[PDB]
Amino acid sequence: TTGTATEPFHGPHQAGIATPPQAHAVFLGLDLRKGTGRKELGRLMRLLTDDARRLTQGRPALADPEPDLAPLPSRLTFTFGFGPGLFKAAGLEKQRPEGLRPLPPFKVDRLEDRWSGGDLLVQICCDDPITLAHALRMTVKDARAFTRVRWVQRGFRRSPGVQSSGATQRNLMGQLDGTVNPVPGTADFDQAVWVQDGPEWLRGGTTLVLRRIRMELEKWDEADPAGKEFAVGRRLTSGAPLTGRHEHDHPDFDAVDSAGFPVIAENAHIRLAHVDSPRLRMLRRPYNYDEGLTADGRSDAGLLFAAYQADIDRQFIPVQRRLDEGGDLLNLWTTPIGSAVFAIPPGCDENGWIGQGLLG
Amino acid sequence: TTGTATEPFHGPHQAGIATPPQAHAVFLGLDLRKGTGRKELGRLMRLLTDDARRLTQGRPALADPEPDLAPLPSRLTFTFGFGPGLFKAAGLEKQRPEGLRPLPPFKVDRLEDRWSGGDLLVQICCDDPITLAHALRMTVKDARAFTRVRWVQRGFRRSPGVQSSGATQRNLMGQLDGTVNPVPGTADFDQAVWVQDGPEWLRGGTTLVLRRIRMELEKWDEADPAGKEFAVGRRLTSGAPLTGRHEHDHPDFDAVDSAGFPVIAENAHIRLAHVDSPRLRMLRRPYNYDEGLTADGRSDAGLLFAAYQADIDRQFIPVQRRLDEGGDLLNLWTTPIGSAVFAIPPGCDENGWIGQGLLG
Ligand code: HEM
Ligand code: HEM
Numbered sequence: 187t188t189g190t191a192t193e194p195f196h197g198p199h200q201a202g203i204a205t206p207p208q209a210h211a212v213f214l215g216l217d218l219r220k221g222t223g224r225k226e227l228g229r230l231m232r233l234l235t236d237d238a239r240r241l242t243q244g245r246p247a248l249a250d251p252e253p254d255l256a257p258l259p260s261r262l263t264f265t266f267g268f269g270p271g272l273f274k275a276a277g278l279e280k281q282r283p284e285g286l287r288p289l290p291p292f293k294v295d296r297l298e299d300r301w302s303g304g305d306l307l308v309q310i311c312c313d314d315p316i317t318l319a320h321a322l323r324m325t326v327k328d329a330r331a332f333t334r335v336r337w338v339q340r341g342f343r344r345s346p347g348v349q350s351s352g353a354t355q356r357n358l359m360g361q362l363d364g365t366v367n368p369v370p371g372t373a374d375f376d377q378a379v380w381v382q383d384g385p386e387w388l389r390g391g392t393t394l395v396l397r398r399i400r401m402e403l404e405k406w407d408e409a410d411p412a413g414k415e416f417a418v419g420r421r422l423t424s425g426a427p428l429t430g431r432h433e434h435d436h437p438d439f440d441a442v443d444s445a446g447f448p449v450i451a452e453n454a455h456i457r458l459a460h461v462d463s464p465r466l467r468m469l470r471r472p473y474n475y476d477e478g479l480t481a482d483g484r485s486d487a488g489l490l491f492a493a494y495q496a497d498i499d500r501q502f503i504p505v506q507r508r509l510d511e512g513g514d515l516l517n518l519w520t521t522p523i524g525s526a527v528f529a530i531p532p533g534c535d536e537n538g539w540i541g542q543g544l545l546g
Numbered sequence: 547t548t549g550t551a552t553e554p555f556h557g558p559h560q561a562g563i564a565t566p567p568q569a570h571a572v573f574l575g576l577d578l579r580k581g582t583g584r585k586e587l588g589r590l591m592r593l594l595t596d597d598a599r600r601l602t603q604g605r606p607a608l609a610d611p612e613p614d615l616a617p618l619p620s621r622l623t624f625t626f627g628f629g630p631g632l633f634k635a636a637g638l639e640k641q642r643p644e645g646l647r648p649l650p651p652f653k654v655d656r657l658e659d660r661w662s663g664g665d666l667l668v669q670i671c672c673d674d675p676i677t678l679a680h681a682l683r684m685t686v687k688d689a690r691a692f693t694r695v696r697w698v699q700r701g702f703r704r705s706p707g708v709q710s711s712g713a714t715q716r717n718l719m720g721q722l723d724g725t726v727n728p729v730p731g732t733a734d735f736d737q738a739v740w741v742q743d744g745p746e747w748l749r750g751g752t753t754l755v756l757r758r759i760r761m762e763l764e765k766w767d768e769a770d771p772a773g774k775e776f777a778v779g780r781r782l783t784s785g786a787p788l789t790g791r792h793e794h795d796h797p798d799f800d801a802v803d804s805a806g807f808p809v810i811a812e813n814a815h816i817r818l819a820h821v822d823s824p825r826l827r828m829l830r831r832p833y834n835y836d837e838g839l840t841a842d843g844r845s846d847a848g849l850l851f852a853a854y855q856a857d858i859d860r861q862f863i864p865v866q867r868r869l870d871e872g873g874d875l876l877n878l879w880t881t882p883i884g885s886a887v888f889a890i891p892p893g894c895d896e897n898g899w900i901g902q903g904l905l906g
Contacts, residue, residue, distance in 0.1 A: 189708035251767040252720035254782050315702040319836040330843035338839050342675040347707050348549035360612035407611035476679045479698050483690035
């Protein structure tokens with residue numbers, strides 16, 4: 187059995203980023219109440235740090251409402267993030283990274299306030315949904331005095347054991363999703379993900395762009411399979427680039443067909459999203475969402491697109507701009523409906539707390 | 547693996563009842579459209595039967611819009627049920643069992659139309675939520691011409707492999723839930739679950755009472771642990787009756803405390819819910835639900851209470867009435883907000899389809 191497995195809470199980095207993605211996630215987006223300043227934020231982060239320290243190791247939180255749901259942590263992780271409004275409330279604008287601001291508008295955006303922004307992120311990931319539901323309840327119990335819930339975004343991947351660790355998993359459009367990514371345990375990952383410049387408190391942390399992206403599955407069902415593959419640049423079943431044979435063949439962006447047109451389209455998703463330098467790649471760690479049906483049978487499903495990077499301006503915005511300005515073929519069937527940005531602090535040890543280097 | 551494992555679709559009984567409950571479930575409640583009569587119902591059930599026959603074994607459905615999501619069936623099962631309103635639409639009123647009718651009102655009820663009733667049930671269970679999401683889309687694709695979606699209720703238990711097979715699992719109140727239950731593959735299970743009297747088409751089937759029961763978790767948090775255990779009649783951690791030591795000890799309903807009062811309260815849940823005859827028990831096969839938060843951090847969570855029994859009038863109603871008239875202490879923290887009843891036909895083989903004995 188696997189319920190006893192844990193991920194370390196303490197370390198130079200917060201868990202939940204380099205951690206291989208678990209089967210379930212909740213992204214809890216919180217707005218600070220009017221009276222919540224620097225002193226209140228310290229009290230809150232000390233509470234939440236201790237909750238995570240205990241629950242991730244299968245021990246009840248202090249004042250745990252349901253202590254029997256703490257054992258069997260199933261690789262529970264907490265990742266805390268600070269939005270732009272957190273720095274304002276704390277009086278710490280000078281410590282806010284220049285790039286930590288709401289993203290610029292893109293033509294494809296259909297953003298909704300109810301899925302956007304947020305002052306404080308609690309990202310909770312777990313291989314088990316009961317453990318996760320309990321961790322969320324404890325988080326809200328300790329946060330409620332200081333914050334209001336702005337949004338809660340629940341997502342899933344494959345259940346534990348359904349696919350081998352490291353095997354690429356499919357999204358709700360049926361596509362293999364996650365082939366090209368920095369790999370933990372390599373110097374390129376550390377360069378791409380962990381902050382080294384800017385405000386000193388953030389060194390060893392990262393940044394997160396969280397975009398709720400709706401999938402237009404009724405339109406997708408009506409699309410021709412050859413057109414679906416051409417829009418991405420990869421085949422559906424194998425995941426191989428259209429220029430290759432296996433999933434991990436490198437896409438050949440110079441290849442042309444017998445008539446001279448690019449094999450991978452000028453506006454194919456993977457062409458527009460690609461960056462040459464491995465050190466500038468974003469870490470994509472997405473979850474799928476599926477929520478409810480209209481009376482005439484239309485789905486409400488999509489992707490919780492979570493991208494982690496050391497620098498939003500250098501590693502996220504240029505890619506998103508190329509997708510938008512290049513007219514990504516995938517935009518015919520996907521629509522951004524929420525967007526939020528967070529600075530993710532470095533990790534802590536025992537006797538410390540998440541955010542201590544900024545708020546303490 | 548957890549992903550390649552299957553459950554047989556064919557047999558004397560439909561799967562998903564005696565099948566040990568998988569990690570995820572969706573209960574899809576459908577209403578028949580105006581033009582959907584007996585002829586349209588037969589066509590619909592033949593379509594859904596063939597979809598299930600294929601998808602449960604990891605093969606794409608006919609005209610599958612995302613066939614790459616069919617492999618890794620992860621113990622997918624489908625269970626189809628017919629509500630009271632289906633029989634009038636088929637012109638088969640005299641084939642409706644006497645006991646197939648909405649439950650009578652109970653004082654604790656706060657039922658909502660959006661969680662209640664329904665002409666046709668598709669219960670889809672699976673160890674994997676991506677497989678389940680795809681199965682749901684395939685079901686809706688084939689049913690939407692003949693029906694409208696009345697509700698969709700998603701629930702979860704532990705992820706696969708978190709606990710050993712057969713071990714009792716906890717609900718969102720932290721309670722072990724499922725201790726006293728007919729065991730699949732036993733004579734008592736067959737007597738309690740599978741219909742043997744009444745209209746011939748239903749023999750080998752069962753009936754389902756599906757109740758969405760909200761847990762008042764904020765009030766539950768205000769309760770002391772002694773009161774929580776007293777309200778049920780069992781200890782939280784061990785699951786043992788208050789009169790015993792281990793989970794599977796028989797409760798001693800005659801034992802009294804030092805004050806001469808029953809150890810298991812006169813209005814304790816397990817006393818009011820208990821039936822002496824194993825052949826009259828109901829099979830409880832519940833799922834947990836957790837859906838969204840108010841701005842002030844109030845949860846929307848509870849139990850998808852699914853009870854299967856050969857006779858609702860003899861096996862469900864008397865228990866539910868005793869909980870209501872007896873003033874079950876658990877009623878302080880639980881509220882029924884939806885209720886639906888279905889007749890579940892017997893299984894089929896490779897030559898037939900679900901409901902053929904009624905609709906063919
Ligand atoms: C619902 C929306 C989206 C879907 C369904 C989707 C799907 C995919 C697929 C199937 C691939 C190819 C396999 C892989 O390497 O993972 C891919 C690659 C990629 N996607 Fe997306 N994507 C979405 C949104 C986005 C967005 C908003 C970005 C913004 C930056 C993005 C960035 C990337 C990158 C950087 C790659 C790697 C391309 C390469 O270098 O080969 N994706 N995506
Ligand atoms: C609504 C939320 C409910 C919760 C949280 C709940 C919880 C529990 C718990 C903790 C037990 C003891 C362990 C076990 O044997 O499973 C139990 C037993 C039982 N419950 Fe419930 N229950 C709920 C609703 C209901 C309802 C509506 C019924 C209606 C029939 C019911 C029928 C039973 C039965 C028959 C037993 C076995 C009693 C025995 O013979 O020992 N439960 N329940």
